[PDB]
Scaffold this active site. Structure first.
Site, PDB file in Angstrom:
ATOM      1  N   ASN A 150      98.111  29.272 -40.647  1.00  0.00           N
ATOM      2  CA  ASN A 150      97.026  28.689 -39.860  1.00  0.00           C
ATOM      3  C   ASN A 150      97.536  27.784 -38.731  1.00  0.00           C
ATOM      4  O   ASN A 150      96.971  27.801 -37.630  1.00  0.00           O
ATOM      5  CB  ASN A 150      96.037  27.961 -40.779  1.00  0.00           C
ATOM      6  N   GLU A 249     102.080  21.702 -50.346  1.00  0.00           N
ATOM      7  CA  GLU A 249     100.815  21.355 -49.695  1.00  0.00           C
ATOM      8  C   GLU A 249      99.909  22.570 -49.852  1.00  0.00           C
ATOM      9  O   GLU A 249     100.037  23.549 -49.108  1.00  0.00           O
ATOM     10  CB  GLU A 249     101.013  21.009 -48.214  1.00  0.00           C
ATOM     11  N   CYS A 283      93.227  23.645 -44.582  1.00  0.00           N
ATOM     12  CA  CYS A 283      93.224  23.325 -46.010  1.00  0.00           C
ATOM     13  C   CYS A 283      92.437  22.052 -46.313  1.00  0.00           C
ATOM     14  O   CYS A 283      91.922  21.901 -47.429  1.00  0.00           O
ATOM     15  CB  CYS A 283      94.648  23.160 -46.570  1.00  0.00           C
ATOM     16  N   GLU A 461     103.685  14.786 -47.108  1.00  0.00           N
ATOM     17  CA  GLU A 461     104.277  14.994 -45.796  1.00  0.00           C
ATOM     18  C   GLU A 461     103.880  13.841 -44.883  1.00  0.00           C
ATOM     19  O   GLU A 461     102.888  13.154 -45.124  1.00  0.00           O
ATOM     20  CB  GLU A 461     103.833  16.336 -45.206  1.00  0.00           C
TER      21      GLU A 461
END
Lengths: 487, 488, 488, 488
Positions: A150, A249, A283, A461
């Site tokens: 994405n 993630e 997400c 992250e």
């Protein structure tokens, strides 16, 4: 375009797999390029290259590394529009997004970590006059990143920036759906002065190339971004083969909680941005929108007004702000979720079909879709769709909405819309999510650690802590007293 | 005999519903110490429900209230040190001269350390612009699980539970089937200190059942495991295939001890002894590959043998006993298999290499202190962890060579260098691929010092400030006080 | 010469309204380099109002916007390194071999370092209970003042302005009246890099007037001073009596260099040379008390004599010149008085001790590099900072003795030890009362390393992450979400 | 009258050699509580030499050993709370309802907080290159001096001594001459807890003599002062002219309480009461400028008057008493002159403004709770700190204006806002120039939360992790393992 190759030790190289794959332009169905696929030997070659490059890289001064990463930033800024166009062709995201977000925020994170390298410090602990301990924050060595489709280049930057800044070499596997910008980045890094081997790119299939990365005994950490199901396979293999540190993630079903005192124009704007940006392929999207029953009808009207302003069309046009999905196979999965929402009794407030006519028949388009009258047991409410499908859910009291928001295995993001001081902090402190927004959605500063609770991830992250998590601690005790043996 | 041992769930002992039990053996005699109930799947479900309830109470307390309760547990542990050590000696076979001086002393040190740090657990605040800022919370994970090993039973239980509790979690702890008894005593001690019910639950059982149920439970947020490298891989895998748990693993090593050309050989020999024969060699951090310069090797061997001859096996409660049997008879068989491979692969046996015999030893799982020399890097006893009293002496010729050979392993837990030279000590240590490094010593593991493995020896760390933080999860919160701008 | 030098206020050069001027000399030739305007009391007030307005613009920018601007300044400094170094050599008398390799290079290094840390400046968050929490902001001080010294003019200007500006403040900088020229060039460079007008203003002047007006001004929140110990006591008094200001002071020292009995004496002599004769002895951190073991004192003396014969005074722009004149004739007079006190008090003159004479030296304030030996702790040259090229060699018998004597001083800036022994190096260093400690080296001052004095040698620190934080002030904010209870 | 109180030096009470004494009064009755000896210049030197010896013992202990000793002191303080609180009430005039619930409890909370952080006090390590690295040590300052104020005597002594002792220092503490008694009790408690002799010495005396001798002594490394703004400028100045000491100052304030237009006025009145009349207004952090929107001023005034009616002066040992006399009769005279200045500039007296009269009041330094309204920014009672029970109410029209007026002062200690709005609360607080900020509350000062002033209200901070670090000094150590290069 030309048949794209692997990038190993600072040059494009032919894959030793004899296998290739195609990446499709999602707006036309045409093939963009043929890409070589890294096999098991290609991974071992990449690792040996990375081991050699990492030693050169770690031996430099901290500021020497800082300056090289900052030169890469300057190149990324200059080439923003060029890189954004390639991203639009590969992903189907409008240029209005890619030229403004994808490379800008990728570069921002590289820029942030470049500046922190000199501040990466260990500790010193006195034990007694005759002994002390000090710690070193050492590179892991060779680490691997597996990217999603994405935000291809942004993900490549968010994984490689802390890794390189911490003194590691990274082997990056882009998604087979969208491999092209990762290879541009490898060239940009070499131009910036990154030593050969420090950032190698291995396009391929996740079933093969990704598995060979997770199994390699000389790779010390895997960072993976993708769906919950895919993450579970990756995380196991990084155990059963060699004991690797891991960051994941994964997806989510993030709740957006609209309070009783919320302005409904603001709430509707936040809900639009939480659902339909990047055609809903994010997400962190707030796909479960909880609204007080007393305001449901008004909020529904405001959502339909804003959905009518959505402009699908030529992805290089300035006013386009909605794109096709990344691939026809993904569209088929998204349409199956939309049909399950219809069959389970959810009320279709709008959308729910593909787009038709000149310029849309050849693309992987799905219309912006909203369901309402949704209940917590429905498939569309419990599972991540990863498409432009908003679910509206009514609620009656604050305790109820907190329980329902938390009653999920996902844990990625969450948000609340309220002008009240106590309600905002009080609600947010009880939500089980790693990324919480008050009166906004989607902003992800380089300074802010982001990642999931529960099934939505492992680790984080961005932020200072992610720089530290790409190092390993070595503890050293200096004993200056006489050592006593009991034998 | 002791009474049959039950599960400890929600502040009281309670009968398992598995219908299954197991026995723990006194390794010095072969006798059954106790029968212990095994926790089945429904027992784990009850423990998690208990933990979830207790965790809410514990975390709602003030930081200093949690601190005072753990300090009360420390005081009881100090008072009951001798009684706890005697029980540990019975269950593990380690000499009382060790257990009463180390196991609870350093276990309680870590709990004491984390009790004082609870109030310093802090998030961050980051200003983005005049109209927006970020702050972070370090929240509890919720319910975490600890799976202990058998060589330091109560120390491991404290090292795992102290940061977990101090970070605001509840822990369900599963002791090793070999050594379940002291973990149950610790549960009683925590309750007597005021720990809310459900915050520390103890489930004896087998790895294949109780351990697996914990690693598979959907409502457990983190697993912390200490054990062998092979067991770690299975544990790490199920903790993903079921529900995506955070993981910490402390596994074995094959740690190198590097003796430099300018080292005093009596110091080197004393360090090598402590690095190999403490707890009968059953220590993950042991320096079982001893690298000695070729020109000193013969003299070093002579000093090792003189010290090995001082080793005093015997009654584990006698003040001067400093060597014990191995933890179990199946473990002894594995250690003897490795000793036999050393002989058959051409390593030179210098001493030991057999069981101990005679009155007092025939019923214990005893192995003589064993030293091999003339070892090469391809031998099985050099490449694999033995977890028994078996030292391998390897000769070397120069510094670059010994660094490469020290690092040429999948293990990465500990290492050490013996040298009086400033430049050599730091220069060598900085090139070793291990998480725990000792200069002119071995074995000391201060509460403040993070410890864990490189490569296949572990994931994560224990002790130090960073491990308190690793038992929390970060929540980032952005407060946007400006107008929100939608592109739609 | 050069054109008249004006004040730099709010992004432009501007005439002073004091009516006063002074001259800066070239210490190699005695020629007037430039007439310089001196800032009066009204000029300082104008500078403060400029700084306040600029600071608000600066502080409202994003952290990365500030970082990019300071990095643009770094790039300019790298490009102009040689031109700025030549100007520094003209104004200070330091050899170009020094100024082109150290002064701007390490000044820009610190600016580069802090530019990258701006986004990492963070507050904290502290949960108190479910209904209340605290978060902190690291807010700018506002307008700060830096008062520079003459030995490293632009390096000091960069070491003070870099953390101040990185922290969100505006700085008003007063360079030494001996050496104002490079600070003015730096002010231009900052504006060219995009620094908002007012964020860095430069006010040349005399200490008696311009310096005192800065310390007294009520809207300046912090003073940072580098200079002599005596001048420090005066500045620190007026910055309390007038308005309560945060204060940082980097004063002189009489730093000990301890040579161990196991030290290689060629290394020890090289370190001692670099610790005494760089910048012609005009360095606050110099190791001017050299402690040498009695048994090696004679041999060490011969090694010093050999190295001192290598010092090359001459043309300051020639590549092989490594020794320059002192900054002024009055400063040399003071150095000559200390030298004469050494002779009268019974120290043995080993070499040097006189002005330099001849064509090329008669116009500058040159002193020969000087070494005294047979020195005792009670001699004036041992007790007081000379700030000239004068080394004192002291003999010692044992380690405890040399530690006592190294510490028996009100100064506390730097210290060092020469030894290859691991235990000796750390053991001795841990006992020395000094803020900057070097093992087997001297003089290196990385941007990462906080540096500053113990005891009378300073207040606070420069460089390191901690100095960025020290140019902010903490605001603690409690969010109380429960119902407030009053007892009235 | 108790027995003549002596100095506390080196673990015992000892007579002063000054020949001078003073008296402390019970402000509720005018009676002499005790004669107290005053420390002379020779007594200060003796205390410093005692402190130097004790500090060496204390710093040589392990971190956890120091932690346990401070924890013992905490336990004694909790046990002796009621006895200490009663003595504090006799000496200060504060009601037992306050002293028993706040003074010792929050003082001991801070000691307990720092006791647990001692083991987490760490330096840093910084790699420069393969051949060199830096590490830092956080070393004790040595002997430090604390100068206490009279409003919270034992709480201040604990807030200064806890970080100082936790950091490895010895403290010489000078209590305020108005309230010297509890500090002498604190010293015995510390010794009873195991604090080494010399680590905490108490020297009663006068500011002009004893306080000055402490600020002048060359071997004291740091002064921490709490007091008025005027006396702080004097103290900070002498601590420079004599010996260059590190300094902390907590001075007075004129803190604003901003009531937003959307505030519930009952909550706002309750916060205003607690911010003005706790401890009879003798609190540096008090919100003595209460800003109220014009449209709500009249309603707010009525709410204030009702709650002032509830204030209950009387027997300080009665349970219902919640208001006491001022600390001394000279301080009452100063507070009365401020009240008369308010009437003479035309401030409207809403209530109070006079002494309390009648049986049980005529012998005490009582002032009635006093509220002025219709106040303006230029009035003396609005510009200057009164340190008495005098609230000033100021009308305002808009948010920008009230922020300007709140900030337009040389004081900077505290501030607060009452508002239910998320954006308004943070947005306003972020613009106020104060180190301590309360949203919808007042007065809570957790041990975790750094507190201190902007501008003229102080230097440095107290409490929080940062204050533990501010009682250490940083020593940077570079290990150079490569060949040292001399340019000579």
């Amino acid at each position: 375009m030309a048949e794209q190759q692997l990038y190993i030790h600072g040059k494009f190289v032919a894959a030793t797999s004899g296998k290739t794959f195609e990446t499709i332009n999602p707006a036309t169905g045409e093939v963009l390029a043929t890409v070589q696929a890294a096999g098991r030997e290609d991974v071992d070659r990449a690792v040996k290259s990375a081991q050699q490059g990492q030693k050169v890289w770690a031996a430099m001064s901290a500021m020497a590394r800082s300056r090289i990463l900052r030169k890469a930033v300057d190149i990324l800024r200059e080439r923003n529009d060029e890189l954004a166009r390639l991203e639009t062709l590969d992903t189907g995201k409008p240029l209005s997004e890619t030229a403004a977000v994808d490379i800008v925020t990728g570069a921002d994170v590289l820029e942030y970590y470049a500046g922190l390298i000199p501040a990466l410090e260990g500790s010193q602990i006195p034990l007694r006059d005759s002994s002390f301990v000090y710690t070193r924050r050492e590179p892991l060595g060779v680490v691997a990143g597996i990217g999603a489709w994405n935000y291809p280049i942004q993900i490549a930057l968010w994984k490689s920036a802390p890794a390189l800044a911490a003194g590691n070499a990274m082997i990056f596997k882009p998604s087979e759906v969208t491999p092209l910008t990762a290879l541009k980045l490898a060239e940009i890094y070499r131009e910036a002065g990154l030593p050969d081997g420090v950032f190698n790119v291995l396009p391929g299939i996740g079933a093969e190339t990704g598995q060979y990365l997770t199994e390699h005994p000389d790779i010390a950490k895997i960072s993976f971004t993708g769906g919950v199901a895919s993450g579970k396979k990756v995380m196991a293999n990084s155990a059963a083969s060699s004991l690797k540190e891991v960051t994941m993630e994964l997806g989510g079903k993030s709740p957006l909680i609209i309070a009783e005192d919320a302005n409904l124009d603001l709430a509707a704007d936040i809900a639009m941005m939480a659902n339909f940006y990047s055609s809903g392929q994010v997400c962190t999207n707030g796909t479960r929108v909880f609204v007080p029953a007393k305001f449901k009808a008004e909020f529904e009207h405001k959502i339909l007004e804003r959905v009518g302003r959505i402009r699908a069309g030529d992805l290089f046009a300035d006013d386009t702000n909605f794109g096709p999905l990344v691939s026809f196979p993904h569209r088929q999965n998204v349409l199956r979720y939309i049909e399950s929402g219809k069959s389970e009794g959810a009320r279709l407030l709008c959308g729910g079909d593909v787009l038709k006519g000149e310029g849309f028949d050849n693309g992987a388009w799905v219309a912006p879709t909203v369901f309402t009258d949704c209940t917590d047991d429905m498939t569309i409410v419990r599972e991540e769709i990863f498409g432009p499908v908003m679910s509206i859910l009514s609620y009656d009291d604050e305790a109820e909405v907190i329980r329902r928001a938390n009653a999920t295995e996902y844990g990625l993001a969450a948000g609340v819309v309220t002008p009240d001081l106590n309600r905002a902090h009080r609600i947010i402190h009880q939500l089980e999510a790693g990324i919480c927004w008050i009166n906004s959605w989607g902003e992800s500063p380089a300074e802010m650690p982001v990642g999931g609770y529960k099934h939505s991830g492992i680790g984080r992250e961005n932020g200072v802590m992610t720089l530290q998590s790409y190092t390993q601690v070595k503890s050293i005790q200096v004993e200056m007293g006489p050592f006593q043996s009991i034998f």
